[PDB]
Write a protein that binds this DNA or RNA. Structure first.
Ligand code: ANP
Ligand code: ANP
Lengths: 663, 265, 661
DNA sequence: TCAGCGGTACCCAATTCGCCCTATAGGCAT
DNA sequence: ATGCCTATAGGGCGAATTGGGTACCGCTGA
């Protein structure tokens, strides 16, 4: 009912930071509420019996309504002392193994709290042996290890090739590729919004072929809108927008036939802006030059005064027709084209094959690749009279080009919404293509923690492999809440492990998942382990304290340490902890065949292994998960398959049986 | 020891007592959060670390005010023993003593109010480090502000370029003006450099760090005697600019004037 | 005493690719000679009895004076078939473990050679079991595994922080930072050229501080010269070039006093370039605008006719002021103001109350809310002489600016040489500053392979670490040609192994090395191993590594058992002590391998002694002659953050395991 | 071929962050 | 009292810096 809770709060220019401590239990939590109401709610939620605040705490209104208030100096909330004091308190060399190291705003609160805590109770704090971050956002929790290890957007090397991105990123428009990338780094867990994606994707699988080509015409409209807002847009950017505007009626027609209320809602959000289409069609030339600085952008008939300044230019336009023709006749070069340049003025460009067939009257102006631009006095004279009056047309053409923003800026907000909706459509049509192509299934979300996969596969590994993945199922529940996965080196024991992680993540982007059938429960935190002890066990310490009943744990090659007795002993304790205490969803890829005695020791754990058939020095890996344990070591058999000399392999097998004779 | 610079002075004096030829000084937030000095001199024993926590008494004084962590490896092959705040436990350090300090003001909000900004007090830390470096060319001193090395003073062997490091300590403009003055009148032995009065800049004139037996001593009358000698050279009266090492008291001062005047002219 | 040798050669747009085969022994080699003379020397060196060439081989002159020539189709030299055929020949899934995978130019020759070998012989050739890449340049041969592990330019994450670059890269000019980066990926091994750098760096140690500010004025002249050659250079680029030209007299003076023949040679390569500096000063304004498009680039006094067309555009404000005054007097309208408009041009604005009191000469141009703007023939005439003169003066500015390329390109070659020399000076002066700053020593090169470090340290780890690096000695020689480094995690196994690798690499950029004293021998190939794959990289090191090569094995045996890894590590350590006798560092957790110094000759037991007091532990970080005492994952586990309660169970589990073994 | 044509790397250049500085008071032993 | 000294905080200015703009790079169906 009533708790004696100690707490602290601090803010910088960025946001707020919060920490608590219960002296009854020894629970020690941390958070970074970004906005004010979240911060007010967190103080109200925890209801600390004693609350710390910095003398210069700006938004005092939050803490003017809390009890047991304490005014503290600023210097106590310094991160340097905080990190130092908390390291000494827990006996750690870093706070990376609490997953709070990269939350300095809150650690200011935690730092000030502990310095105060060690002093308020002035008692031994062995029960307070860990701090943990509770994210204010409870949609998803993704650490850097997961993004770098599951390879959602970045492979182990650091490249963006053979990622989940690269696979799903067959998006026709670039703004779709980015919205796809953001979704993967922020998997939605509003089951309603996820189902809104799953119903949209199901409806578009059939209509995906018709819409994709229309979406490819649009291009990156979102980045064009960013330049339009800055008033720095280019004519060829406005041409892409006009090209995109012409597609909106076509997209509105194709999405009208699709039976999906979210699609119909997206279709209304899409808009038309056919007024803005009409504007640009009338305003701009069908294919204008690269920059507005050149002019020759805005088509004649839009502005009459542009035509008055371009009255000289109108005479000038068929003067360039008369000069291009006369010079094409005289020289005998048909690739001869007269065009404008802001730096040099008007020039005569000829193809490189016909460049040196030009006469001596032609003076070199610009040297290009597969072209040579020239100048003559008649043009250079004509260039001057045009540059000036067409300059007052170009100044007006640039002034009218700014006025095009003034006609687009009323809808700018609606165009961004439309662009985001168009970008979202590309993503969900792209996913609808991928799901249709790869026959992905729609996973349905349940209330209790667990994933029930029917013949599921690794969504990325199956695409990059030269062999069809051996699809295998998974039955996770709070009854079967742990799997000890033993197997060979380069055996593929880390596939079924990683495939499970992607399936959850792919399910939580509302996208159809790589399996025959999946039924999944709440997975809020993904915690991962992958080799390189001063880096490896630091992550294992972070996954142990942070991981909950709902968190998906993926430990790979754990206990690669100073011996086979230190690594096993830790691995034994970690597997026990996650089965005995936390009872968290854990996927333990390991070589420790001694840990295969845990399914009989522990409740929740199951022995699985990757079947591999070895004949002589060469070997075949079935890459197929079988319920059991690895028969023996295969690094000998793999070593030859990697290319290691047979002299080493023979000597390995000769030294093996001298060591295997002991054990 | 309210000024961080005065604390720095005490810690370097403890490093000179160790006899260290390598000094590295670390500073955080203007020198308030961290004052880490690592030294390669004599390494006080784990027992000598415990009583220094409880020159040892001066270490106890900063340990009570701040959470001073001191780790020292004994000359005898041994793990260094690191005494926090009050916990002494094994540590890794080469033979020698390291004196790390947490926020100097762990229990003094008045001393935080006494702290003057973050840079002006660092400039006072620089001044102290600048003065001891001249006195002891023998010991290397590497200075870092907010974890960023500012000055690289390099240990000078006997017969080595003392002028090069002197030039680094007081700036190149001082060294150029500075004329090497080595005057011995019987028992009285003066060694150092005095900036040329005519072309001496005001900042060089402010730099007048006089060391008696390798201990910085400022006397207005000694300054007046050098200022008189400056006023003898040319009419304009600019502040005396002299860095000297003298082993000696009032009769000396009469021969500090004549001894300096003879070299100046 | 000659052999029957078979070979193949192919070229692309980039360079040449080469391969050979002796049917008597079964040796198979690969190379990529970039230039023609290297390629001619390689054919001359090998002297194959039978030589293959593609029907479309461009530089035929190489092979038209050779014997046993064979004209082959193009398709046989395709990399797709080559990789596929060679993979199934060796029985590998990749050619990464031969160090030839990223050498496609050479593999075209090798691919064509083997397809021809399988057709010439048409018998079992298991005596062909391996290929190897041997680009024995003055440059060290390093796999990208070294460059990603040593963190020369890129840390494990992919950032350029906590690198050897970041530390040594205090270079004032960007073209210095790049030449520093190339040196570190291409360590020079012409011992003469290395000593030329070491004597240069010793002499500039004192003068380093004075030169650096002068070098910061130069900027990236090298990339400006690249735009100058393309005739795409910008006025501010030419300003930086002029700013750099003004420094050459100053640098020639400072480097004249410095006693070092290589410095004096570098000082002559740099050049006075006073004549180019004078031309740029006369021509360009001190600080011109961004582009030539805008004009206002070329200063008055260079071109008389530029100043003529300018004089029209300068006779403007006074003309309009007299007009404004005369028209204000004549009309009697005091609100009459003559101003410029970028959209419409020059106008005459009168307040709306006085707008319709204006005379009949005034033609309407712009109607405003608070006024009426007009145009008159005198203005409209004056508007023409301005607008045209701007353009003609501006056109002359673009033409002169292009003409300045015709005056600069004659020296372009000499400016590139000077730029490379200036970039080299920045590197050298920066390295001299770092050596002065970080108390680095000059390592002296000996004849036989081996590194003798006296209280040496990790050049990067020492810089960013809050605590001082514990100095580490090393005695590598062809007698002590391997060290078994066991101990804890945070023992310093990987540090002492990677510190040795950097020391070699930093010694082989002619730069002063992070140690009190080093005496180093010929190291031709630096090879390193680290987890992401494993067996793949180790094989490349076994196949490529020689008596002289530096081997940096980190935890061989991260496999599938206790024995698979131990047995392999034992065979690899035996191989590199028994057969190859390469300079090898084998930092591993296998305490079982500590029975090698008694088994092998050349191997020596060392360890990073760690003394555990109470629950916590101290790592001496000091290399001691012996082996690891015990397991330390338990001691580290706490230091990683793990709850002590799980360790209390883990230590109890270890105690049961200790009773067995 | 080919003429745009959109992308893409990369060099600026105003902006942001940190460093310096000089009038502006105080300040404390005398 | 007091009078020469001294640190100080806001302001000015320079050095890093990443967004913004340009010259450059393929390149992509037609
Ligand atoms: N069905 C399959 N057929 C062929 N290859 C597969 C299959 N499934 C997975 N693989 C690949 O087999 C390789 C083995 O996995 P890999 O991660 O290299 O080794 P591991 O033993 O799983 N990892 P580790 O524990 O760190 O040694 C990878 O290249 C997988 O992508
Ligand atoms: N000579 C040294 N002096 C001080 N600290 C050191 C030294 N060598 C290593 N360290 C510290 O040790 C850690 C680096 O681990 P390192 O010794 O490189 O790997 P290791 O002993 O092989 N452990 P592991 O990576 O798990 O296999 C960091 O905390 C360094 O600060």
């Amino acid at each position: 009912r009533q708790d004696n809770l100690l707490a602290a709060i601090w803010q910088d220019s960025k946001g707020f930071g919060y920490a608590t401590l219960d002296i009854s239990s020894g629970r020690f939590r941390l958070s970074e509420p970004a906005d004010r109401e979240t911060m007010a709610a967190e103080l109200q939620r925890t209801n600390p019996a004693e609350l710390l605040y910095a003398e210069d705490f700006a938004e005092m209104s939050l803490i003017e309504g809390r009890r047991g208030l304490r005014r503290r100096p600023l210097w106590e909330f310094e991160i340097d002392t905080a990190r130092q004091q908390l390291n000494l308190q827990f006996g750690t060399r870093d706070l990376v193994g609490f997953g709070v190291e990269n939350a300095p705003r809150g650690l200011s609160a935690a730092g000030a709290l502990l310095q105060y805590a060690k002093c308020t109770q002035r008692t031994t704090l062995p029960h307070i042996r860990s701090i943990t971050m509770e994210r204010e956002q409870d949609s998803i929790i993704m650490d850097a290890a997961t993004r770098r290890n599951l390879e959602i957007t970045q492979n182990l090397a650091g490249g963006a090739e053979n990622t989940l991105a690269s696979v799903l990123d067959s998006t026709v428009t670039p703004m779709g590729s980015r919205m796809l990338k953001r979704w993967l780094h922020m998997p939605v867990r509003d089951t309603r919004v996820l189902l809104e994606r799953q119903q949209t994707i199901g409806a578009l699988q059939d209509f995906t072929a018709g819409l994709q080509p229309v979406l490819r015409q649009v291009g990156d409209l979102e980045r064009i809108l960013a330049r339009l807002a800055l008033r720095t847009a280019r004519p060829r950017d406005l041409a892409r927008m006009r090209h995109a505007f012409q597609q909106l009626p076509e997209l509105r027609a194709q999405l009208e036939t699709v039976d999906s209320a979210p699609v119909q809602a997206l279709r209304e959000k899409m808009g038309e802006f056919a007024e803005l289409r009409d504007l640009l069609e009338r305003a701009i030339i069908d294919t204008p030059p690269v920059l507005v600085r050149d002019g020759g952008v805005i088509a004649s008939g839009y502005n009459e005064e542009l035509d008055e300044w371009r009255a000289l230019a109108d005479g000038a336009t068929d003067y360039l027709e008369r000069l291009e023709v006369r010079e094409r006749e005289r020289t005998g070069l048909d690739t001869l084209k007269v065009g404008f340049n802001a730096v040099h003025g008007y020039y005569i460009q000829i193809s490189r094959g016909q460049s040196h067939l030009a006469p001596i009257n032609y003076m070199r102006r610009q040297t290009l690749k597969n072209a040579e631009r020239y100048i003559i006095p008649e043009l250079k004279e004509y260039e001057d009279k045009v540059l000036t009056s067409k300059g007052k047309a170009l100044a007006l053409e640039k002034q009218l080009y700014e006025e095009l923003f003034d006609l687009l800026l009323p809808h700018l907000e609606a165009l961004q919404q439309s662009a985001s909706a168009l970008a979202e459509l590309d993503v969900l049509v792209n996913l609808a293509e991928r799901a249709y192509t790869l026959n992905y299934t729609s996973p349905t979300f349940i209330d209790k923690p667990g994933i029930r996969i029917t013949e599921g596969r690794h969504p990325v590994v199956e695409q990059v492999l030269n062999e069809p993945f051996i699809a295998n199922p998974l039955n996770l529940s709070p009854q079967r809440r742990m799997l000890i996965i033993t197997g060979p080196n380069m055996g593929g024991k880390s596939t079924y492990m990683r495939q499970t992680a992607l399936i959850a993540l792919m399910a939580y982007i509302g996208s159809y998942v790589p399996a025959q059938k999946v039924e999944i429960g709440p997975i809020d935190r993904i915690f991962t382990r992958v080799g390189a002890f001063m880096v490896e066990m630091t992550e294992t310490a972070n996954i142990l304290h942070n991981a909950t009943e709902y968190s998906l744990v993926l430990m790979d090659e754990i206990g690669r340490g100073t011996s086979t007795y230190d690594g096993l002993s830790l691995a034994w304790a970690v597997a026990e902890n996650l089965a005995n205490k936390i009872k968290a969803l854990t996927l333990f890829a390991t070589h420790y065949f001694e840990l295969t005695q845990l399914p009989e020791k522990m409740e929740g754990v199951a022995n699985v292994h990757l079947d591999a058939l070895e004949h002589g020095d060469t070997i075949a890996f079935m890459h197929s998960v079988q319920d059991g344990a690895a028969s023996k070591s295969y690094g000998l058999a793999v070593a030859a398959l990697a290319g290691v000399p047979k002299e080493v392999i023979k000597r390995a097998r000769q030294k093996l049986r001298e060591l295997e004779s002991i054990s | 020891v309210e000024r961080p610079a005065s604390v720095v002075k005490e810690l370097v004096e403890n490093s000179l007592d160790a006899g260290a030829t390598r000094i590295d000084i670390d500073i955080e937030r203007g020198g308030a959060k961290l004052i880490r000095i690592r030294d390669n001199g004599s390494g006080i024993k784990k027992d000598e670390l415990a009583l220094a926590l409880a020159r040892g008494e001066a270490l106890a004084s900063i340990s009570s005010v701040s959470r001073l962590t001191l780790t020292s490896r004994t000359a005898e092959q041994q793990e260094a023993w690191q005494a926090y705040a009050v916990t002494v436990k094994p540590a890794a350090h080469p033979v020698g003593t390291t004196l790390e300090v947490l926020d100097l003001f762990y229990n003094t909000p008045a001393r935080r109010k006494f702290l003057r900004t973050e840079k002006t007090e660092f400039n006072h830390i620089d001044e102290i480090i600048r003065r001891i470096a001249l006195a002891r060319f023998d010991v290397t001193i590497n200075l870092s502000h907010n974890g960023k090395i500012v000055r690289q003073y390099r240990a000078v062997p006997e017969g080595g370029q003392k002028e090069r490091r002197l030039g680094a300590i007081l700036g190149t403009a001082f060294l150029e003006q500075a004329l090497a003055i080595e005057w011995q009148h019987g028992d009285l032995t003066l060694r150092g450099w005095v900036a040329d009065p005519n072309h001496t800049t005001p900042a060089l004139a402010e730099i007048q760090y006089f060391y008696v037996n390798g201990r910085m001593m400022r006397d207005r009358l000694i300054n007046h005697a050098i200022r008189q000698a400056y006023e003898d050279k040319l009419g304009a009266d600019q502040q005396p600019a002299f860095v000297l090492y003298l082993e000696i008291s009032r009769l000396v001062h009469d021969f500090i004037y004549q001894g300096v005047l003879s070299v100046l002219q």
